[PDB]
Design a protein around this ligand. Structure first.
Ligand SMILES: NC(=O)OC[C@@H](O)C[C@H](NC(=O)[C@H]1NCCC[C@H]1O)C(=O)N[C@@H](Cc1c[nH]cn1)C(=O)N[C@H](C(=O)O)[C@H](O)c1c[nH]c(Cl)n1
Ligand SMILES: [K+]
Ligand SMILES: [K+]
Ligand SMILES: [K+]
Ligand SMILES: [K+]
Ligand SMILES: [K+]
Ligand SMILES: [K+]
Ligand SMILES: [Mg+2]
Ligand SMILES: [Mg+2]
Ligand SMILES: [Mg+2]
Ligand SMILES: [Mg+2]
Ligand SMILES: [Mg+2]
Ligand SMILES: [Mg+2]
Ligand SMILES: [Mg+2]
Ligand SMILES: [Mg+2]
Ligand SMILES: [Mg+2]
Ligand SMILES: [Mg+2]
Ligand SMILES: [Mg+2]
Ligand SMILES: [Mg+2]
Lengths: 88, 64, 117, 52, 100, 102
RNA sequence: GGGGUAGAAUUCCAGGUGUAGCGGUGAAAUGCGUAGAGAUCUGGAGGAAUACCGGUGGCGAAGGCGGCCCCCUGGACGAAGACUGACGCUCAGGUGCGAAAGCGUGGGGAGCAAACAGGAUUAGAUACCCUGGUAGUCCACGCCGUAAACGAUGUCGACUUGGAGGUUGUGCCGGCGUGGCUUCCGGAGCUAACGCGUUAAGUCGACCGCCUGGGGAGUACGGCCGCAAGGUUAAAACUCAAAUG
């Protein structure tokens, strides 16, 4: 997992407030942070299939949240993916 | 099972203590189980049937 | 020859056979005798009585060393575990202690397959 | 449970140096697991014996 | 991140232990070392022989440190031919209170 | 460990046992060939081969059909065995042909 | 997932002591031993596996996972809140994971052991039993994609009497509650019956997979996949009047 400080940074950045942990921006930012963090793990540990199942769940949850944000508000979507550097 | 014969003890009494030390420690039962290879499915199956027996005796102790 | 005050009786009690060996305290062999060498052959070896006889002949082998104390070191699940030491005490050694030295692996190597009989 | 607390641990090993079941000693399952870890750590440091 | 380091020294090399305990703590206290506990247990009787030795000089240390410096300390124990055995553990919290 | 290392070579003296293969009148070709291959294996390795042919019930009437089978095995193992004894009558309810290795 | 490491044991090697057996079976023999075995003791080498704890205990989607320690890492659960605001459920095709055996390449090889060799047994003995023993079992990387891969029970959600346990949280004052997971019994109900029974095989809803007499056959042919072994998809003629629970 991410550290409490790493989490608290993202919530402040991508949220409307520090209290706002729920927003799709924060959620996607949190998922992105961890997904990108674990790329180093699975580079070394190629055979760690049990952990990788957790990574695919993050990617699947991010995709679903982004797709929700797209049809909810394209402006928020377009801003978010460019900030995080997501293709889609 | 290490049995020093204590200050003035008979042999027959001392032998009973040695045999009992082995019986509690579990040496003859241990050697016999390690004589032949038991594959995990057999081990698990044996452990289940014991658990069923043990528990079923308690339900026979109860209802009576 | 040398005199030895205190000895050690190693009893290799297998299922098929009993080996009794008296050593020094540092495990130097003084004399040995087996149930197989006691005029028992085949499955005659694997009785308590054949072990008893093997003990007696082992005692007779180490009369010259002049031993009165023995420490017993029984090993294995053999039928002649207790019959050896009983017969050793009958030879007139003061049995100071009895130890079980049966090798148990803490897992160790895979045993042979079960006999289908 | 502590691996350094040899006094308490010695109550839950036999003469040979084997861990006693929780059914015998009446230990709770959670503490029995901590006990077993402690004893094995003590065994590594040669504070307790494995065998004999 | 809160460790507990026991190490056992060759009982003849009990005189080296003074100098080594300094080096280890000096390295730890170099990088935000919080020596919560330090107990020279002394030359105890071993429960079984390690390398034909029936005694060894035990030491305990409960420290908070970087997770790099402890791995770097573990590297030294391997190289230290005097020190015969060591268990580095992870504790959740600091232990200040005394052990028997 | 002295006399055994001589008696090993004395034990090497091969002990020719008799191997019994039992035929019937009804025995079919495929099964005859199995039993023949068994007999070949024995006589190849220098083992004698007792060859019974058992009758059951009213097969005792037609004895000559039994004799054909015993005659046939002799013929098939003509160059691989000699007939130590060929049967004449049905002793009991059997006719025994002991072959020998060449 | 990765790395390190501990103790026990088997084998082997080198020594010491020692002397005629050892080993094995239903009974034997092969085998091993006077070039000194087996036994016992000291030291060394190497590989594989982790006694006790250990539990109808735990964890994991399933397969599966068991010394201890560290590093990296996934999930689950509880307590109070705060936050987002239907973002959900299922899922043909697709993608990945997937015991053991097996395959390729290179290592490793203690113990075990298909094949095989010898010894027995027997009517025969291509076996069961005995002594050996190669692949393999172990590691790396790649392949294979199947198992009674089973709870022979798809996934998700709601509802519907009880009793006795286990394991793991938590509140309150051992007691009194309240969550998660799990074992056994049993009520209504259901079921051909056996049984299942709030972890349903009950009462309902969503979506998927699958069945339509037995044998022929999970076979042939074709496609796809595989280095191969084979896997996957999957008929028909024909024949039987059954097969089956
Ligand atoms: N050979 C032939 O064609 O026929 C003869 C056969 O029927 C003999 C019969 N055999 C058995 O049961 C097998 N059971 C499995 C283990 C091996 C074997 O034993 C049998 O009676 N055995 C005796 C021993 C024996 C072999 N040859 C002559 N006698 C036996 O002791 N059998 C035991 C039993 O029947 O319970 C048991 O099987 C056993 C113990 N130890 C051994 Cl070896 N076998
Ligand atoms: K060292
Ligand atoms: K879909
Ligand atoms: K091999
Ligand atoms: K009925
Ligand atoms: K095909
Ligand atoms: K048909
Ligand atoms: Mg699990
Ligand atoms: Mg399974
Ligand atoms: Mg679904
Ligand atoms: Mg495999
Ligand atoms: Mg290979
Ligand atoms: Mg073998
Ligand atoms: Mg075999
Ligand atoms: Mg299948
Ligand atoms: Mg199925
Ligand atoms: Mg029920
Ligand atoms: Mg039904
Ligand atoms: Mg096919």
């Amino acid at each position: 997992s991410l550290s409490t400080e790493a989490t608290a940074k993202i919530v402040s950045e991508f949220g409307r407030d520090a209290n706002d942990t729920g927003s799709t921006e924060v959620q996607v930012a949190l998922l992105t942070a961890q997904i990108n963090h674990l790329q180093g793990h699975f580079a070394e540990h190629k055979k760690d299939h049990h952990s990788r199942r957790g990574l695919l769940r993050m990617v699947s949850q991010r995709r679903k949240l982004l797709d929700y944000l797209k049809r909810k508000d394209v402006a928020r979507y377009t801003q978010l993916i460019e900030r995080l550097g997501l293709r889609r | 099972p290490v049995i020093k014969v204590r200050e003035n003890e008979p042999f027959d009494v001392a032998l009973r203590r040695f045999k009992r030390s082995c019986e509690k420690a579990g040496v003859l039962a241990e050697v016999r189980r390690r004589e032949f290879y038991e594959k995990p499915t057999t081990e698990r199956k044996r452990a289940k049937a014991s658990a069923v027996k043990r528990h079923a005796k308690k339900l026979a102790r109860e209802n009576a | 020859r040398k005199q030895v005050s205190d000895g050690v009786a190693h009893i290799h009690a297998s299922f098929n056979n009993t080996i009794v060996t008296i050593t020094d305290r540092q495990g130097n062999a003084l004399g040995w005798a087996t149930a197989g060498g006691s005029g028992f052959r085949g499955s005659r070896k694997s009785t308590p009585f054949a072990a008893q006889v093997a003990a007696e002949r082992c005692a007779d082998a180490v009369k010259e060393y002049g031993i009165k104390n023995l420490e017993v070191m029984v090993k294995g699940p053999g039928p002649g575990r207790e019959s050896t030491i009983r017969a050793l005490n009958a030879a007139g050694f003061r049995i100071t202690n009895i130890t079980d030295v049966t090798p148990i692996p803490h897992x160790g190597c895979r045993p042979p397959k079960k006999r289908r009989v | 449970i502590d691996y350094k607390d040899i006094a308490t641990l010695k109550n839950y090993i036999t003469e040979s140096g084997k861990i006693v079941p929780s059914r015998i000693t009446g230990t709770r399952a959670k503490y029995q697991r901590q006990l077993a870890r402690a004893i094995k750590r003590a065994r590594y440091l040669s504070l307790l014996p494995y065998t004999d | 991140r809160h460790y507990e380091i026991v190490f056992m020294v060759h009982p003849d090399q009990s005189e080296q232990v003074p100098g080594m305990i300094e080096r280890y703590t000096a390295a730890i206290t170099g990088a935000e070392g919080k020596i919560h506990r330090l107990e020279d247990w002394g030359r105890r009787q071993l429960a079984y022989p390690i390398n034909k030795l029936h005694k060894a000089h035990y030491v305990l240390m409960n420290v908070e440190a970087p997770q790099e410096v402890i791995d770097e300390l573990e590297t030294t124990f391997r190289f230290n031919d005097a020190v015969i055995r060591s268990m580095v553990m992870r504790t959740k919290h600091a232990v200040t209170e005394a052990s028997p | 460990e002295k006399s055994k290392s001589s008696k090993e070579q004395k034990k090497k003296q091969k002990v020719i046992q008799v191997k019994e293969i039992k035929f019937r009148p009804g025995t079919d070709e495929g099964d005859y060939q199995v039993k023949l291959r068994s007999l070949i294996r024995f006589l190849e390795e220098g083992d004698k081969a007792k060859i019974t042919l058992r009758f059951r019930g009213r097969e005792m009437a037609h004895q000559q059909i039994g004799m054909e089978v015993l005659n046939r095995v002799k013929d098939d193992l003509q160059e691989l065995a000699v007939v130590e004894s060929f049967p004449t009558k049905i002793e009991g309810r059997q006719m025994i042909m002991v072959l020998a290795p060449k």
